[PDB]
Amino acid sequence: IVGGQEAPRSKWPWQVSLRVHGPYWMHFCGGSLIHPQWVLTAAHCVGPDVKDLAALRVQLREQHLYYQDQLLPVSRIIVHPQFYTAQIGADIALLELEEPVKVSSHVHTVTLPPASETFPPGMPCWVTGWGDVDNDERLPPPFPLKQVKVPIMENHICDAKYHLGAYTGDDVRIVRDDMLCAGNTRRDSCQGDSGGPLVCKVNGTWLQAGVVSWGEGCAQPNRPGIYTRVTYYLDWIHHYVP
Amino acid sequence: IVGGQEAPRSKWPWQVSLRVHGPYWMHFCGGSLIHPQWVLTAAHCVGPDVKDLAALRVQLREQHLYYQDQLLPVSRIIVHPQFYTAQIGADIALLELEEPVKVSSHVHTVTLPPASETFPPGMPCWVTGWGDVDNDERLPPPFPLKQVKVPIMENHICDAKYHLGAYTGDDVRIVRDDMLCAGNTRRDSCQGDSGGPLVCKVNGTWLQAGVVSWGEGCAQPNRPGIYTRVTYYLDWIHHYVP
Amino acid sequence: IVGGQEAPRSKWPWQVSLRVHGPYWMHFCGGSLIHPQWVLTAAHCVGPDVKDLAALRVQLREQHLYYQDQLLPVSRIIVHPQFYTAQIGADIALLELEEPVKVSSHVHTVTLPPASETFPPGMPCWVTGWGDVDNDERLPPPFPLKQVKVPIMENHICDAKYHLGAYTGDDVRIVRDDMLCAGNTRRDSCQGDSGGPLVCKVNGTWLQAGVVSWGEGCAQPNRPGIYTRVTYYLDWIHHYVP
Amino acid sequence: IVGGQEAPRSKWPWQVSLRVHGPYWMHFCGGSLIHPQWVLTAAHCVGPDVKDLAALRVQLREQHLYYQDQLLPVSRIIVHPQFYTAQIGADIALLELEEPVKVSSHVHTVTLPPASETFPPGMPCWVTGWGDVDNDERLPPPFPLKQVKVPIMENHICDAKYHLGAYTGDDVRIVRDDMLCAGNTRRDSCQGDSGGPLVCKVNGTWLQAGVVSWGEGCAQPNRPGIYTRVTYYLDWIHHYVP
Numbered sequence: 001i002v003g004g005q006e007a008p009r010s011k012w013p014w015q016v017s018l019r020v021h022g023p024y025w026m027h028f029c030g031g032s033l034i035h036p037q038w039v040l041t042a043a044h045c046v047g048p049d050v051k052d053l054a055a056l057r058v059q060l061r062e063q064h065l066y067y068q069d070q071l072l073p074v075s076r077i078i079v080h081p082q083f084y085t086a087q088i089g090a091d092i093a094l095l096e097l098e099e100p101v102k103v104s105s106h107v108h109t110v111t112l113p114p115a116s117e118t119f120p121p122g123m124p125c126w127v128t129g130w131g132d133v134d135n136d137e138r139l140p141p142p143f144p145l146k147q148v149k150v151p152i153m154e155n156h157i158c159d160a161k162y163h164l165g166a167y168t169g170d171d172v173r174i175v176r177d178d179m180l181c182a183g184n185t186r187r188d189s190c191q192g193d194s195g196g197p198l199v200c201k202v203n204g205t206w207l208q209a210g211v212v213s214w215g216e217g218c219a220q221p222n223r224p225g226i227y228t229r230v231t232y233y234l235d236w237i238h239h240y241v242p
Numbered sequence: 243i244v245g246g247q248e249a250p251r252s253k254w255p256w257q258v259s260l261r262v263h264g265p266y267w268m269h270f271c272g273g274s275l276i277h278p279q280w281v282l283t284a285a286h287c288v289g290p291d292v293k294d295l296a297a298l299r300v301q302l303r304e305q306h307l308y309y310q311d312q313l314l315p316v317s318r319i320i321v322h323p324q325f326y327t328a329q330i331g332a333d334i335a336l337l338e339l340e341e342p343v344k345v346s347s348h349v350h351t352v353t354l355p356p357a358s359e360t361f362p363p364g365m366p367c368w369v370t371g372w373g374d375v376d377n378d379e380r381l382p383p384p385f386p387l388k389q390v391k392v393p394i395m396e397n398h399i400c401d402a403k404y405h406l407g408a409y410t411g412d413d414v415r416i417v418r419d420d421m422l423c424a425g426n427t428r429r430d431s432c433q434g435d436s437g438g439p440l441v442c443k444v445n446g447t448w449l450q451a452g453v454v455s456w457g458e459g460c461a462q463p464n465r466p467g468i469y470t471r472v473t474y475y476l477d478w479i480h481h482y483v484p
Numbered sequence: 485i486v487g488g489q490e491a492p493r494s495k496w497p498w499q500v501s502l503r504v505h506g507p508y509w510m511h512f513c514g515g516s517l518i519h520p521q522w523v524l525t526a527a528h529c530v531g532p533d534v535k536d537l538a539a540l541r542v543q544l545r546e547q548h549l550y551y552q553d554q555l556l557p558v559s560r561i562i563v564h565p566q567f568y569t570a571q572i573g574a575d576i577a578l579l580e581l582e583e584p585v586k587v588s589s590h591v592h593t594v595t596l597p598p599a600s601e602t603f604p605p606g607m608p609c610w611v612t613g614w615g616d617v618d619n620d621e622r623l624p625p626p627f628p629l630k631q632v633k634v635p636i637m638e639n640h641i642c643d644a645k646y647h648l649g650a651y652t653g654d655d656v657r658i659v660r661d662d663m664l665c666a667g668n669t670r671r672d673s674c675q676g677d678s679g680g681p682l683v684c685k686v687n688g689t690w691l692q693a694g695v696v697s698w699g700e701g702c703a704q705p706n707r708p709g710i711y712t713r714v715t716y717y718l719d720w721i722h723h724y725v726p
Numbered sequence: 727i728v729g730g731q732e733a734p735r736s737k738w739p740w741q742v743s744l745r746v747h748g749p750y751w752m753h754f755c756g757g758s759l760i761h762p763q764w765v766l767t768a769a770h771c772v773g774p775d776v777k778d779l780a781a782l783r784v785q786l787r788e789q790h791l792y793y794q795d796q797l798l799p800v801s802r803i804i805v806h807p808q809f810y811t812a813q814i815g816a817d818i819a820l821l822e823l824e825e826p827v828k829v830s831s832h833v834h835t836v837t838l839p840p841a842s843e844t845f846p847p848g849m850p851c852w853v854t855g856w857g858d859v860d861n862d863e864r865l866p867p868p869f870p871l872k873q874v875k876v877p878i879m880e881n882h883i884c885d886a887k888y889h890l891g892a893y894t895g896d897d898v899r900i901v902r903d904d905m906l907c908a909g910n911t912r913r914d915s916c917q918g919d920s921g922g923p924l925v926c927k928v929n930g931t932w933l934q935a936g937v938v939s940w941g942e943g944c945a946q947p948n949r950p951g952i953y954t955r956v957t958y959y960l961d962w963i964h965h966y967v968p
């Protein structure tokens with residue numbers, strides 16, 4: 001997370017840490033609890049190549065990474081069949097927990113938005129995670145959960161910004177329809193925040209608008225953060241998630 | 243170049259080295275001389291981001307990289323407008339030299355194939371460059387120009403190989419129509435060979451089948467090297483080069 | 485710390501973490517609280533070149549590094565005048581805290597050994613710190629305070645052991661009189677433990693026998709860990725410490 | 727080599743490159759031909775630990791490293807018995823070639839100085855090698871043999887300069903009598919030049935004043951380059967070299 005601050009303990013109960021087995025259970029990606037037995041993440045975190053379920057663990061809401069570790073095993077890894085790279089699209093994945101979680105006030109699910117829900121500029125939106133604080137600058141220990149309020153940019157305006165300083169033809173789409181744009185040179189998501197949630201307060205309720213996907217660096221000029229549009233993959237999510 | 247050996251001095255007169263200004267004029271990509279004043283390379287070498295022409299030089303055929311440097315300036319960089327990433331496609335670019343080179347027996351152009359030209363499966367072809375010898379294994383000094391014989395893998399067969407051990411749906415194409423496959427676990431192109439030529443001897447004439455583009459690692463199981471199909475972009479090439 | 489285990493919360497109340505200002509207050513060396521206002525460390529940690537007082541902080545006993553931080557400023561950095569390198573000797577330094585610490589059962593001082601105290605082999609001795617777990621293998625998060633029981637080796641035996649597979653003449657002393665030897669191929673101190681204490685239980689009382697100084701790698705054959713002999717610099721310590 | 731320029735082909739015929747086996751015969755240290763069958767170098771290059779003769783090769787004067795390789799085998803490695811560390815001193819070693827070198831105008835021996843020569847400040851002295859061009863800045867390809875005119879400093883002044891900005895006592899010797907000082911913030915030897923020669927023109931004859939040994943970084947304020955004083959070890963060299 002570029003800019004912003006450390007998140008208070010009561011905020012973002014849905015935020016999860018994805019862990020890989022090595023010298024320790026290392027955080028590689030973020031995620032969000034969308035159902036007591038289901039975690040929503042980015043496909044690039046757990047794909048496109050087949051991963052070993054034994055080498056993966058899910059860590060629920062934690063104020064400081066690695067401190068209060070209570071790792072949960074994964075039953076199923078479901079990656080969108082249209083996924084290959086974050087730039088092509090379909091950067092969405094589902095993780096089925098071995099057993100459903102005990103929902104508390106400190107740890108509970110995030111509400112998915114309706115199919116017709118469009119997130120326009122000016123809407124209060126926040127992105128969370130334990131990712132890099134800047135380009136090539138990792139989150140320092142004790143690795144606190146960071147939060148940043150990001151401004152939403154319209155897809156066509158964001159696509160136009162991505163063409164500035166690029167050879168890519170103006171008619172050639174960089175920011176696709178299954179993507180969402182948010183952030184600026186001071187506020188953005190980064191490497192390590194991938195798979196994590198982008199929540200927006202719509203009529204007094206928090207709705208996950210996006211999934212941290214990609215971008216040309218972090219908080220760089222004319223390069224806002226790109227997220228997988230949750231509304232676009234609602235039919236695919238509901239096929240596995242009740 | 244993975245496998246093979248040091249190329250003899252008389253072989254591959256079209257092979258060029260692309261140089262970027264830093265502590266020294268360092269090799270970042272390969273290429274091929276297609277016209278005395280034009281160089282064919284991969285778009286990812288010089289894009290999608292707009293490059294500074296003063297910070298770029300072209301080095302003609304050299305037995306040992308950096309030894310007899312005769313750096314040539316560039317007047318134009320023409321990156322295909324459909325290019326953004328090597329996986330999406332259109333990984334092709336043209337470099338116009340400031341002055342046309344004096345064509346000789348040691349340094350001369352490569353013949354481009356006709357519009358209908360097909361490269362059969364199992365056909366022996368050659369890939370050249372000063373790239374890495376293996377995954378995370380740089381070409382050791384005095385950096386000789388390397389060559390390797392690579393077998394052609396048909397597009398549908400190669401696409402199926404990329405789906406082996408991947409979540410990506412069988413109906414979702416990884417190896418695209420504007421792409422070409424070549425190599426195995428012992429013979430392949432690698433990081434640094436990008437932009438370089440893939441040559442096939444057809445009826446006693448060397449034709450450039452592909453431009454080194456991408457691949458999931460170098461000489462990895464079920465992951466052959468991906469090349470930009472020259473035949474697919476002949477009209478775009480002929481629009482700029484006479 | 486090579487080998488051993490995570491130290492219990494009730495053990496080593498004198499253990500100190502030395503912090504340097506950078507992207508965060510990074511641990512660079514260990515230390516021991518010898519007086520409520522004085523910290524004993526290695527000279528190579530804070531020298532031989534003059535350090536900025538404002539860029540240094542002292543962290544008292546932590547079960548997990550960086551998690552429960554309460555950084556203390558330093559008022560004086562006293563490095564032994566005979567110090568240049570750890571191999572030459574006099575690898576000892578004192579850090580005066582700006583204010584004295586409120587002593588408790590969990591955080592208290594270590595007793596310095598008497599002037600004529602020798603530490604022969606077989607004695608129950610432990611070395612503590614948050615250093616590397618092996619050669620080029622960092623202590624993984626949540627960075628637990630580690631301990632290891634290390635066997636003491638006689639100075640002349642350890643000195644002759646350092647000459648094994650070395651061109652250095654047998655008459656040329658490697659392990660000097662101001663040094664102490666401890667550890668083996670399974671039990672040792674490493675990079676990051678430097679400045680930390682080597683404590684021995686003598687007559688039911690814990691005495692600081694040494695200060696982590698140097699060694700040819702960590703837990704390598706015929707290369708035990710080298711410590712600064714505390715008894716040798718007792719007069720120098722007592723000149724500043726009450 | 728920090729500062730200066732690329733050496734002309736006719737200059738420094740005694741300069742040699744020391745090679746170690748791995749992915750290629752990599753340069754690790756410099757040296758000098760003092761006798762047709764003997765090479766003078768620094769002890770830290772080949773010690774204090776015993777090295778395998780088969781993994782070591784000697785390369786005679788080369789304008790560009792690796793380009794015209796004619797690797798020569800070594801029969802004996804003689805490291806000074808007083809050596810352990812460059813800072814302690816005796817950083818001198820002799821390498822006996824398997825066969826004597828066929829001496830020519832391009833490749834010949836350097837004259838050792840008489841015992842009486844102290845090399846005072848103001849002598850025209852040069853240091854040569856293929857080492858780093860600055861701190862953490864490696865010599866760029868085609869790796870040309872570099873040279874730099876370095877100002878000689880008197881031992882007591884160089885020792886006092888090393889105490890500036892250091893805790894080390896003014897009466898505690900840093901620069902020993904078996905050492906020689908040369909260089910400034912623009913002209914110095916660096917990592918990779920170690921073992922190489924420091925030559926001074928005395929009575930129209932090039933005499934090797936020193937062997938590149940150590941220093942606190944390269945071209946750093948009040949930290950000139952430290953060389954092993956050849957005259958000090960003249961008796962030791964003559965015990966092996968005819």
Ligand SMILES: CCCOc1sc(C(=O)N2[C@@H]3CC[C@H]2C[C@H](c2cc(CN)ccc2F)C3)c(C)c1Br
Pocket residue numbers: 087188189190191192193194212213214215216217218219224225226289290291326327
């Ligand atoms: C022109 C190439 C467009 O495709 C991109 S952007 C891009 C990039 O710059 N990235 C850095 C590091 C990996 C990749 C995506 C990273 C990233 C950016 C964001 C948005 N700031 C969020 C999460 C995240 F992981 C930032 C890469 C590697 C590729 Br391929």
Ligand SMILES: CCCOc1sc(C(=O)N2[C@@H]3CC[C@H]2C[C@H](c2cc(CN)ccc2F)C3)c(C)c1Br
Pocket residue numbers: 047048084085329430431432433434435436454455456457458459460461466467468
């Ligand atoms: C699932 C991701 C598919 O897209 C790929 S493959 C891929 C990869 O493994 N590469 C390594 C290093 C960069 C990228 C392409 C590299 C490469 C392979 C080849 C084929 N052996 C030729 C040239 C070349 F530069 C080999 C990357 C970074 C990305 Br994004």
Ligand SMILES: CCCOc1sc(C(=O)N2[C@@H]3CC[C@H]2C[C@H](c2cc(CN)ccc2F)C3)c(C)c1Br
Pocket residue numbers: 571672673674675676677678696697698699700701702703708709710774810811
């Ligand atoms: C010529 C060998 C003697 O001088 C030495 S040993 C030595 C070494 O191998 N070290 C590694 C990394 C730095 C230095 C000291 C390190 C070390 C070893 C120990 C004992 N295992 C304790 C603390 C500690 F920092 C282990 C170095 C850099 C030097 Br100079």
Ligand SMILES: CCCOc1sc(C(=O)N2[C@@H]3CC[C@H]2C[C@H](c2cc(CN)ccc2F)C3)c(C)c1Br
Pocket residue numbers: 531532568569813914915916917918919920938939940941942943944945950951952
């Ligand atoms: C205060 C510690 C004194 O002893 C030194 S100086 C010193 C240092 O800064 N060095 C850099 C890298 C290794 C070591 C010696 C290096 C060096 C300097 C020079 C002179 N500029 C020539 C050759 C050479 F290898 C420059 C080290 C590692 C040690 Br241990």
